[PDB]
Amino acid sequence: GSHMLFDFENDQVPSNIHFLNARASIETYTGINGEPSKGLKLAMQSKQHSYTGLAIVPEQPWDWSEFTSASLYFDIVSVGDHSTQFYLDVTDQNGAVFTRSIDIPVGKMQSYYAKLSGHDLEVPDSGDVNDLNLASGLRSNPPTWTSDDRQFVWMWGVKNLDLSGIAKISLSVQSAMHDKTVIIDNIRIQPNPPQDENFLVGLVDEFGQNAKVDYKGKIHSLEELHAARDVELAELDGKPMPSRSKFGGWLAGPKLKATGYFRTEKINGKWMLVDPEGYPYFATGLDIIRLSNSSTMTGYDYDQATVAQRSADDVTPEDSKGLMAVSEKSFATRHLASPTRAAMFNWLPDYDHPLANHYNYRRSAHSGPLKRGEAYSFYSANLERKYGETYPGSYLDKWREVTVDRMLNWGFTSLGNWTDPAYYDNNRIPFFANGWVIGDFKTVSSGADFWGAMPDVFDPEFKVRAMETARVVSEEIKNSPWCVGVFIDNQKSFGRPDSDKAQYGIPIHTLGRPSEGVPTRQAFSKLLKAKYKTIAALNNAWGLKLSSWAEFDLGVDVKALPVTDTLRADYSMLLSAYADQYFKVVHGAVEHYMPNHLYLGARFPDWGMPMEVVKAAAKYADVVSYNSYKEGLPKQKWAFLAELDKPSIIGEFHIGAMDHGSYHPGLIHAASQADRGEMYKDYMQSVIDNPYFVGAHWFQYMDSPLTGRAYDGENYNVGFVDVTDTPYQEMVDAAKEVNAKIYTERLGSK
């Protein structure tokens, strides 16, 4: 309990705690130890405001440099009907920040801690700036000691702050659908207990489950797995919810023009899809209906001469490739690259074991302790355990059939993004198709290109690649009426919302480059010459003194120029031209090979939707797609949709919990499985209420691997099914409740 910062026992709201869209007071409540105590009650006006919370800002930064192995603790409980996800941001005197987050249930108050130093922060990650994981290759670790306190979950930022000056501690609730209220008490620093040197050892049992924790629903033997199977199989009969048309549209509603394909139409002031037969349609369903992302790095590697190399022409990025069948020749050369990874697994099969076919090999990774290596899919292994093999790979066919039966039973109207192409002829439930434009075209920088530099969309090779991407999608979907539409790409790093530098990173970086060999720079220069005509008019506009356009075309540093209204207008126009060109080229390619199908945009995240780029999508995309990892769609955040007046779709959302073995709930956190389901209905209700949305897909079908998906270490409870391929009943029930009213509520009387 070493160092108490705030116990509120002096009955005052400290004046160095600042509050935003929240009321604070001191109240008596029953604390952890059973005794009455003074605590801070914080009532956030989070239904009305998309940012609320407190910020502790001491007059001088705290000097905690003596605490070389210590954590910051809070006692927290939610009050009322709703759990609370708090974002903890701690900022030091050099501006460096980390973010952690956790759910705060209603009910019994607990202690929560955020490491400041020591243990699994000591060697924090791989040293790569884009690696958000801990050194283990997990996005957030199990705790480094045993206790009743709850560890705030790692999200992103700097692992090792300058403890000689901590400048701000922030707790916030963001984009909520409801007012949230908490009591906070006993804000303190405690030295860390000794590190448990086994904390990363023996994490995973043979089913891929958390080995050390026995939770409700955990599988303890093959027989229990088969029992869960048989119970589910007896209930799945292939029957869609009542009053669905053939393509999952609404039978009981207006019947509109039938074109033979999914299309868009505004119905009584609300955007809808319309299915090939003319019935109103609203898209619900799950992303990642595939096994590509279900494998986890085992810590072994192969002799490179034994591994097939990637073709330069492949349209599929490594993260979305099928699980790679590992040969005997490769497996013979198996050696240990990460002792830390390898010691995580209580069981991996020998080359000759019947489950050894669920090995995978990844030739790259976005982040983690390994750049490449062997991986294993426990989920895939469990499909073999559940369904057996009556000819090679038969459990996969059975998986796909059970998957479509599930979606129909659960009331979903579609298979979501990243559905394996083997579902494309299921001819029982519609699906969404996808492609990625990748290749060797030139690139530009935005300043935040965490997944690779942005495409130079004016390079003719970009268009050659987009056409190849669309050709392959068209080949896959076979012009099917079951295909709702095509997503291309995902969350491209167009710009970030922080600042002018962040928003206009593409214009700014690009203007800095010479025109020669840079097609986007050439297009920007061409646009500025058309607007201004003369170098003197440009000089006047930007406050510069270039001698000529030729000097301008050697590259101009605009980083230190203050952003006048004139300068912002040129940056805005440049970003618009760039986004217009991206969308023109992708739209054109999709239209060329798939003239009948909806083009669904590029899936803008919350952090990557500058208005220039949205307006460009709205011009070319039939439906504008957004990813939104929030508790819902707040009113003010989405009010801009009315001006665009385009049908829109949520590509991705989720809510996770940690009561089913996971070390990380995911991006948005619930107090339990039940609370996950409640939060799902809250999110979906906001989608259903918004007249611009024609659907929302949940990311993803299955939990990520406990020890992290191979690509980048995400280890989240974000599935409708767990690693044993067993449904979370609470999500199933929430989905049924939601899917039963999508049509009646949206289209009905009020």
Ligand SMILES: OC[C@H]1O[C@@H](O)[C@H](O)[C@@H](O[C@@H]2O[C@H]3CO[C@@H]([C@@H]2O)[C@@H]3O[C@@H]2O[C@H](CO)[C@H](O)[C@H](O[C@@H]3O[C@H]4CO[C@@H]([C@@H]3O)[C@@H]4O)[C@H]2O)[C@H]1O
């Ligand atoms: O430090 C960067 C961070 O900045 C913070 O401000 C952001 O809020 C963080 O946002 C996140 O950015 C990424 C990673 O998590 C999601 C969150 O918005 C964004 O990604 C998508 O969401 C899920 C999360 O479970 C996956 O990461 C998903 O990744 C895809 O999965 C499959 C299909 O396509 C690829 C792709 O990686 C893979 O094969 C993302 O769509 C953060 O930006």
Ligand SMILES: [Ca+2]
């Ligand atoms: Ca107290």
Ligand SMILES: [Ca+2]
């Ligand atoms: Ca993966």
